[PDB]
Amino acid sequence: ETVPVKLKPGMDGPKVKQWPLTEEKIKALVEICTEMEKEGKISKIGPENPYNTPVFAIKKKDSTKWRKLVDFRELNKRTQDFHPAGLKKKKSVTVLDVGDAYFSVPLDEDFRKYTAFTIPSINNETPGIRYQYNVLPQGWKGSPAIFQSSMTKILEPFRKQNPDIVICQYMDDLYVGSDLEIGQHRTKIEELRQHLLRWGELHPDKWTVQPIVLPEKDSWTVNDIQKLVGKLNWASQIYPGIKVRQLCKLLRGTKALTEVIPLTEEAELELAENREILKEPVHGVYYDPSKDLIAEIQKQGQGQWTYQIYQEPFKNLKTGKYARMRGAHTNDVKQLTEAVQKITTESIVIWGKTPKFKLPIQKETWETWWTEYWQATWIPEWEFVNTPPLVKLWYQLEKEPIVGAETF
């Protein structure tokens, strides 16, 4: 028996246009889909079905076989509705993919039509191949919810054998957190893993919300004060106690930018007080479940990026930096996508929800190549923006290790 699933009140199905796919991905999808069709997991549909969701193919971070990824964002937004805080604590979390479990469960036949998707044809010579789901799809939020009851069971034995370990499930992924040492962790994973088959490395503590640090300086030029004052003044939006009157007083005059200016004992203190203020995150910023999580990224350059998660402007919940991984030296898009996936995952672990992204890239650029480097089973919301010069200059000012993180 299948559980009846309905769209939210007054909603109609998604009718999202399929983006162009490259030939390698189209062949792959055909192969993946003919196979699925035999198994009766998906069924060819006609033109009387107006709905449509975009599909694509990726090769997960560990694969030489293509996987099929469907963009159910729209459907999800339109699908009816249905977090162990310790997960963000644990000194070790491993993500597991249980997405295949769903294909074992049938989808309410009345709802199957909304899952329609199209495999496009090169140069449009051929009509697209239209399919639709018979079993719980991956990426769809209704899946983990319906398979919830079953997941609880298959998992129960393990939970009870280790009330220590915290298991949390988000979308297609299963998050396991423990404090055992590495080997000790990994071993208990394989136990769990094997229990799953039987039926058919993250470290949350390093995510310290680093502070902003002003430049200390032996000598100061007019240009330096100005730069400094410009950023401070802007920061006072976050920390109202920041003052600059003493510094702006040392600038009284039409001097050469390169001219050095000796600071007064007052400009000294005013500057010292500001460093003090900046030693800790603004007070009283708590997370509100009923609000959306925003994540905005700034391209700092030379391979560096900065981000901030917040719900209310200036009241960040978490800030950070991120440097490209070897190999992405000549690709901003590759880098950026890697950053999104990382930030999104952190959000899941912490708040258990994906943030909405404000990306510093042109829409056309993003839509054209992001899937080429995407590797997660989920896809967050995102909008494209223009980075204010100052928001970028401020976070460039964030603290970093005196050395880093040491290995022999």
Partner 1 sequence: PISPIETVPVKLKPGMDGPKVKQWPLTEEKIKALVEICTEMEKEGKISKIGPENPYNTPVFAIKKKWRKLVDFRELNKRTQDFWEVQLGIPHPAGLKKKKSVTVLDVGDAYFSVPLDEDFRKYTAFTIPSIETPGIRYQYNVLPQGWKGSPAIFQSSMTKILEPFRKQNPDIVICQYMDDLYVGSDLEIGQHRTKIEELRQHLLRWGLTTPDKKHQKEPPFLWMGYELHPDKWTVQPIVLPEKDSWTVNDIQKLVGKLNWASQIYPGIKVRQLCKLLRGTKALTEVIPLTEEAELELAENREILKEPVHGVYYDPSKDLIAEIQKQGQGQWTYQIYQEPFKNLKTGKYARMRGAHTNDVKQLTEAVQKITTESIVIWGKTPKFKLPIQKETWETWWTEYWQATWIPEWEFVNTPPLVKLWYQLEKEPIVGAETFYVDGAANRETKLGKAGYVTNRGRQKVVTLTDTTNQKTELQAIYLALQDSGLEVNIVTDSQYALGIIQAQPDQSESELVNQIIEQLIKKEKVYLAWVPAHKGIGGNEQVDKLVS
Quote the tokens at residue 154: 């298959």
**48 Cβ contact list (under 8 Å, min separation 6):** none
DSSP one-letter string for 104-141: GSBPPTTTGGGG-EEE--GGG-SPPEEEEESB--SS-T
Q: Which of 249, 275, 279, 291 binds partner 1 (CB under 8 A)?
A: 249
Nearest distance, CB of residue 221 and partner 1, angstroms = 8
Q: What is the DSSP letter of 262?
A: P
Q: Which of 197, 256, 403, 405 binds partner 1 (CB under 8 A)?
A: 256
- Distance in angstroms between the alpha carbons of the first and the last residue of the chain: 58
| Degrees to nearest 5, angle at CA 173 with 172 and 178 | 160
Nearest distance, CB of residue 35 and partner 1, angstroms = 17
Residue 164 annotated as part of some ligand binding site: no
- Dihedral sign, Cα of residue 330, residue 333, residue 337, residue 342: positive
Cα 265 to Cα 38: distance, rounded to the nearest angstrom? 81
Using a 10 angstrom Cβ sphere, with 0-12 exposed, 13-18 middle and 19 or more buried, the burial of residue 86 is middle
Residue 292 annotated as part of some ligand binding site: no
Interface with partner 1 in residues 53-112 (CB under 8 A): none
Q: Does 323 bind partner 1 (CB under 8 A)?
A: no
Binding range to partner 1, per CB under 8 A, among 60-68, 125-133, 283-291, 313-321: 125-133
195 to 234: interface string for partner 1, x by CB under 8 A? --------------------------x-x--xx-xx--x-
Q: Does 389 bind partner 1 (CB under 8 A)?
A: yes
Of 185 and 324, CB closest to partner 1? 324
The residues with which 174 forms a beta bridge, in sequence order, are: 96, 169
Q: Does 341 bind partner 1 (CB under 8 A)?
A: no
Cα 362 to Cα 365: distance, rounded to the nearest angstrom? 5
Residue 100 annotated as part of some ligand binding site: no
Nearest distance, CB of residue 248 and partner 1, angstroms = 4
**Which residues sit at the interface with partner 1, rule CB under 8 A?**
17-18, 20-24, 26, 46-50, 52, 116, 118, 120, 122-128, 130, 221, 223, 226-227, 229-230, 233, 244-245, 248-249, 251-258, 299, 301-302, 330-333, 335-336, 359-362, 364-366, 368-369, 386-387, 389-390, 392
